[PDB]
Amino acid sequence: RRDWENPGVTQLNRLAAHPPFASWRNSEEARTDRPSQQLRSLNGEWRFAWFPAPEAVPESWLECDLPEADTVVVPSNWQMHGYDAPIYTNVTYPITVNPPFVPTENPTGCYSLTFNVDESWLQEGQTRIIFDGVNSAFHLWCNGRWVGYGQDSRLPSEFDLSAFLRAGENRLAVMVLRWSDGSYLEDQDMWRMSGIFRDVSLLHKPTTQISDFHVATRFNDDFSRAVLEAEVQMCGELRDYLRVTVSLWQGETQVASGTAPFGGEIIDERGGYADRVTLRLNVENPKLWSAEIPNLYRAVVELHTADGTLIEAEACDVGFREVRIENGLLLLNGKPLLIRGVNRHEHHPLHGQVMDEQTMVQDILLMKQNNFNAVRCSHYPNHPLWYTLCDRYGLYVVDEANIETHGMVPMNRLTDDPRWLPAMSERVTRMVQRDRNHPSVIIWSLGNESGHGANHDALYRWIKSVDPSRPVQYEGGGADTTATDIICPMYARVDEDQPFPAVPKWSIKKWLSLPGETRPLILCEYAHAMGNSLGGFAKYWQAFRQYPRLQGGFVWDWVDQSLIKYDENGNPWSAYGGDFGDTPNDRQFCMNGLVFADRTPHPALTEAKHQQQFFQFRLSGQTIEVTSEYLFRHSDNELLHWMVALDGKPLASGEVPLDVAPQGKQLIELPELPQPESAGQLWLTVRVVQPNATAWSEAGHISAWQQWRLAENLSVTLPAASHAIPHLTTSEMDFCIELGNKRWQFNRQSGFLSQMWIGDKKQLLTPLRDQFTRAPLDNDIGVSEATRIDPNAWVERWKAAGHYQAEAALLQCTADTLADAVLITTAHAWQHQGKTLFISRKTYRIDGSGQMAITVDVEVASDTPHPARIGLNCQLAQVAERVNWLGLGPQENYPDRLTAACFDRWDLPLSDMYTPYVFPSENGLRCGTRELNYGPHQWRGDFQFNISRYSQQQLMETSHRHLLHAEEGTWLNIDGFHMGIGGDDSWSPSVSAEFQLSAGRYHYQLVWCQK
């Protein structure tokens, strides 16, 4: 039958979908969510053999273990065990496009398990097997007899095994196909793996049983009264003595309870559902659920007889909340949300796509700690425990059907085809049936990047009909089609329109007001965090706060999908597309997260944390105004710490309790601040600190901060004049300057400072030279590739202009003596093929104090692409342990990504001054720096810098961080100006005009001296 090449067959003998069951036979266990003896895990060691096609599988395997099989753990992805390669392709399908067919060489994983079944499970009732995730399709046999088949790699497939098992040992055999017609609906941008990658379990239910239950909560106008409505369905034999009891508990207190026999109200001319009953429980003053305060109740559903014997119980956590769109705004409990979201794939660097509770918890704690309140399941239903953690920890969730056909041409070729409606329908309906009782899900999504086809419209309506409690969104076809209640673009920019034909991405501000438009706008994806990125993040947040109908967005994305590989020496390294021999592949495009695959943060996460703060601040005088962005809670776990420092020197500080209602303000007046000792800039830093631990944070967690400049007393005191004057020695080759223990050498043929000495120690490994390029970031490169150059990418523009190849031509090099110093003046031209790109004019003034003041004035031809940076660089001979500076920090920060950084005095080990992005590039810059100290050296001025053991040339020549090698000494890059890093997207230029170095003429000044 080749059922795996027929979209008309997505399953055979599979049971209906339904919310999470456990068939407790003790009600108290159900109340507390304790393990159920009726729900057993079959996870652990199984037998597995790999074959190249289903045709190669031997018949013997159905009845007997293959001697050649290996023993492996399940769940797992077989690529993670080395049986074949995982493939990283973004848009292009990994298989030839020829629906509904798949390749004849189709990797097949033959899994089997011998396991015991107690006779008690078989004497009465039904025993079913549940496979929570099998990628991408499979057949199942039990004790050699075929049971059924299933597709949709991201929802559970359940089969009744009652008539196939026997007391004692039994053997299951599962043949899993890597590719199937379901693969045409699974083209998400992620590694392509396969296997039994989610839990496998066995569930026993009585013959008369709860087969489905739906929980709804509806409220009065002020949310002070609710009615909990629980519709319960049974399968099995109806009898007048059956009853359903639904009880609701808040902790250990029972809030309400109702009992009824089965028999629903009349629905139509034929009657009602004799096999269903709806219980309605009044709840006064319910404690409401939100991501701010995830209050939960427990609904316990008992099926029992009138005389009181329990048959079984099921149950769920219940969050009383209403979600609705009114007057153009998405409201939660009547108040407008501000979504601080992130897209999150299920990815683990060692386990592939298998998820575990520890990793789930770690992700949610980091998310909450970084001020996220929402997550989008990009792009498929997740492992079931995810929803339970979001309900309990408190995160809003977008639950999304496992439908993506991005590689089709045009993209809606399948979604507008009715023959594909059935298969798509089950991906949407099975998801709603399974997850509709979770309060954390607040919005349903129809899938991702599958264009806009009529199947979408049909499905959108089906959901609207079966569950009116949550909005439906879908971005395909232009983000504002008739299949979405929310305008949900991906990568639309704040102010800049991208008027692509048919599916333009308008500026978000403009989009809201197009003629006739009235829906809320929440980006389904924005701020693509690939590599050194998140440039322009603050521009989205300023817009979200100013426009009511801009209600936020989901950043793309949480974690890099890098996989671990081992080198010849056994040492692990982070790999990306193409590193497994996979081709074609999309190389580093699989790494776009705020965090590395092991959960270590990238520097961008701090930027997100700051912009997503829940407290806003203004300063007038010495009065700090604190405004709360919480909608529901008072600031009952927060105090404000304030500190004033002079040039990094602490002058004073205090603490004040914060007591701010949701949406309210608090005014705090600072104390009189005595006058500072000397000249400099006073800076005020305030932080919101939570003194008590929460379920998601430690005592002392800092949730928000902000700084302002206070008074400045510019320095007017003349410097203590030199007890000595430097001496110049002129030679045909060089100009040398000597001052005590110091010596400076300027090469006359190159016009650069080629050497410096302290005592008898040389300080430089490479001379001090102008630098106008950077090792290109992912955002500078975009989709450009050696074999398919994208001439529009910044990297290509610079390359084509000769920026990386330009040679300095000396125009002038002279020396003069002044009354107290020596003055060296140079001028160089950087040219390429005859064109002068940049002119650098400098003066170096060395005085009796030993200080060398460098003044730089650069001209940049108006018609050359604006350069990545304007600065100097050199390789110092020394390697020191610490980097100390007065400037923005402590983490890496760039012009268009520096809001989270604070101006203060920071000191870190040198290695923290390098950010190990998997794909190496310019990194580690710190901006707004007035003093930098390293080894015996100090530089002062107003510049940006980076310092590390890797030169820019090395970073640009190296594709994987594991291949980098520390160079001799230390590379210092000191910039007067640096271009923004961008990131609205990583496939087109995204650096906004205000962060491009287009001024034509630039000036900067540095003082270099000893420490």
Map the footprint of a second copy across residues 504-523, applying CB under 8 A.
Answer: none
Map the footprint of Mg ion across residues 400-429, applying CB under 5 A.
Answer: 406
Q: What is the SS3 assignment for 638? A: coil
Which residue is catalytic, options 158, 314, 449, 892? 449
With beta carbons less than 8 A apart as the criterion, state whether 46 and 74 touch: yes
Map the footprint of a second copy across residues 554-613, applying CB under 8 A.
Answer: none
Query: What span, in angstroms and rounded, lies between the C-alpha atoms of 542 and 127?
Result: 56
Known binding residue 527? Answer is yes
CB of 462 to a second copy, least distance (A): 4
**What DSSP letter does each residue of 460-483 carry, written as one string?**
HHHHHHH-TTS-EE--TTTS-STT
User: Is residue 323 a contact residue for a second copy (CB under 8 A)?
Assistant: no
Query: What span, in angstroms and rounded, lies between the C-alpha atoms of 585 and 262?
Result: 57
Residue 449 designated active-site:
yes
| Site string (536-565) toward Na ion, x via CB under 5 A | --------x-----x---------------
Cis peptide bond N-terminal to 959, omega within 30: no
Query: What span, in angstroms and rounded, lies between the C-alpha atoms of 977 and 993?
Result: 14
Stretch that binds a second copy, among 10-18, 46-54, 701-709, 960-968 (CB under 8 A): 10-18
Query: What span, in angstroms and rounded, lies between the C-alpha atoms of 301 and 316?
Result: 9
Amino acid in position 428: V
For 532-583, strand residue ranges (E) read 550-555, 563-566, 572-575
CB of 435 to a second copy, least distance (A): 14
**What DSSP letter does each residue of 301-318 carry, written as one string?**
EEEEETTS-EEEEEEEEE
CB of 97 to a second copy, least distance (A): 11
Stretch that binds a second copy, among 380-388, 427-435, 880-888, 937-945 (CB under 8 A): 427-435
Contact partner at residue 269 from Mg ion, a second copy, Na ion, none, CB < 5 to 8 Å by partner kind:
a second copy
Contact partner at residue 502 from Na ion, a second copy, Mg ion, none, CB < 5 to 8 Å by partner kind:
a second copy
Could you tell me the two tokens for 507? 């500026």
Burial class (CB in 10 A: 0-12, 13-18, 19+), 936: middle
Pick from 439, 920, 935, 980 the residue near Na ion by CB under 5 A: 920
With beta carbons less than 8 A apart as the criterion, state whether 751 and 810 touch: yes
Q: Using the minimum distance from each CB to a second copy, give the nearer residue, 264 or 662.
A: 264
Q: Using the minimum distance from each CB to Na ion, give the nearer residue, 382 or 628.
A: 628
Amino acid in position 718: L
Sequence-separated (6 or more) residues with CB below 8 Å from residue 156:
17, 130, 131, 132, 133, 198, 384, 434
Could you tell me which residues are beta bridge partners of residue 974? 872, 945
Rounded to 5 degrees, φ, ψ at 265 are -65, 160
Pick from 533, 635, 826, 970 the residue near Na ion by CB under 5 A: 635
Residue 68 designated active-site:
no
Amino acid in position 31: R
Map the footprint of a second copy across residues 393-422, applying CB under 8 A.
Answer: 406-413, 418-419, 421-422
| Site string (574-603) toward Na ion, x via CB under 5 A | ----------x----x--x-----------
User: Is residue 452 a contact residue for a second copy (CB under 8 A)?
Assistant: yes
Contact partner at residue 270 from a second copy, Na ion, Mg ion, none, CB < 5 to 8 Å by partner kind:
a second copy
Q: Using the minimum distance from each CB to a second copy, give the nearer residue, 417 or 517.
A: 417
Rounded to 5 degrees, φ, ψ at 610 are -70, -45
Stretch that binds a second copy, among 458-466, 857-865, 938-946, 990-998 (CB under 8 A): 458-466
Known binding residue 585? Answer is yes
Amino acid in position 734: D
Residue 353's nearest CA partner among 75, 631, 127 is 75
With beta carbons less than 8 A apart as the criterion, state whether 835 and 802 touch: yes
Stretch that binds a second copy, among 130-138, 173-181, 474-482, 541-549 (CB under 8 A): 474-482
User: Is residue 145 a contact residue for a second copy (CB under 8 A)?
Assistant: no
> Which letter, b or e, does each residue of 26-35 get, where b requires 16 or more Cβ atoms within 10 Å of its Cβ?
ebebbbeeee
Give the number of other CB atoms < 10 A from CB of residue 565.
Answer: 16
Q: Furthest-apart CA pair in the chain: how many Å?
A: 113
Known binding residue 960? Answer is no
Map the footprint of Na ion across residues 684-713, applying CB under 5 A.
Answer: none
Cis peptide bond N-terminal to 345, omega within 30: no
With beta carbons less than 8 A apart as the criterion, state whether 977 and 840 touch: no
| Site string (429-468) toward Mg ion, x via CB under 5 A | --------------------x-------------------
With beta carbons less than 8 A apart as the criterion, state whether 606 and 891 touch: yes
Known binding residue 406? Answer is yes
| Site string (228-267) toward a second copy, x via CB under 8 A | -------------------------------------xxx
Contact partner at residue 132 from Na ion, a second copy, Mg ion, none, CB < 5 to 8 Å by partner kind:
none
Known binding residue 526? Answer is yes
Which residue is catalytic, options 322, 426, 525, 796? 525
**N-term to C-term CA, the chain:** 80
Radius of gyration of the chain measured on its C-alpha atoms: 33
Cis peptide bond N-terminal to 58, omega within 30: no
Contact partner at residue 454 from a second copy, Mg ion, Na ion, none, CB < 5 to 8 Å by partner kind:
a second copy
Residue with tokens 């490169």: 781
- Sign, CA dihedral 993-996-999-1002, equals positive
Pick from 56, 64, 167, 274 the residue near a second copy by CB under 8 A: 274
Could you tell me the two tokens for 358? 């520890």
Known binding residue 589? Answer is yes
Contact partner at residue 584 from Na ion, Mg ion, a second copy, none, CB < 5 to 8 Å by partner kind:
Na ion
User: Is residue 93 a contact residue for Na ion (CB under 5 A)?
Assistant: no
Could you tell me the two tokens for 44? 């652990």
Contact partner at residue 267 from Na ion, Mg ion, a second copy, none, CB < 5 to 8 Å by partner kind:
a second copy
Burial class (CB in 10 A: 0-12, 13-18, 19+), 358: exposed
* Site size for a second copy (CB under 8 A): 57
With beta carbons less than 8 A apart as the criterion, state whether 505 and 480 touch: no
Pick from 71, 285, 309, 465 the residue near a second copy by CB under 8 A: 465
CB of 746 to Mg ion, least distance (A): 41
Q: Which H or E element spans position 431?
A: helix 421-435
Q: Using the minimum distance from each CB to Na ion, give the nearer residue, 38 or 703.
A: 703
Could you tell me the two tokens for 707? 């700084």
Pick from 101, 462, 547, 632 the residue near a second copy by CB under 8 A: 462
Contact partner at residue 343 from Na ion, a second copy, Mg ion, none, CB < 5 to 8 Å by partner kind:
none
Q: Using the minimum distance from each CB to a second copy, give the nearer residue, 417 or 738.
A: 417
CB of 8 to Mg ion, least distance (A): 7
| Site string (155-194) toward Mg ion, x via CB under 5 A | -------------x------------x-------x-----
HSE at residue 914, side-chain half, CA atoms within 13 A, is 22
CB of 538 to Mg ion, least distance (A): 9
The annotation places the binding site for substrate at: 90, 189, 449, 525-528, 592, 987
Chain positions contacting a second copy, by CB under 8 A: 1, 6, 8-12, 16, 265-274, 406-413, 418-419, 421-422, 425-426, 429-430, 433, 449, 451-452, 454-455, 457-462, 464-466, 476-478, 482, 500-503
Chain positions contacting Mg ion, by CB under 5 A: 3, 6, 9, 168, 181, 189, 406, 449
Chain positions contacting Na ion, by CB under 5 A: 189, 544, 550, 584, 589, 592, 635, 638, 658, 920
The annotation places the binding site for Mg(2+) at: 404, 406, 449, 585
Catalytically active residues are 449, 525
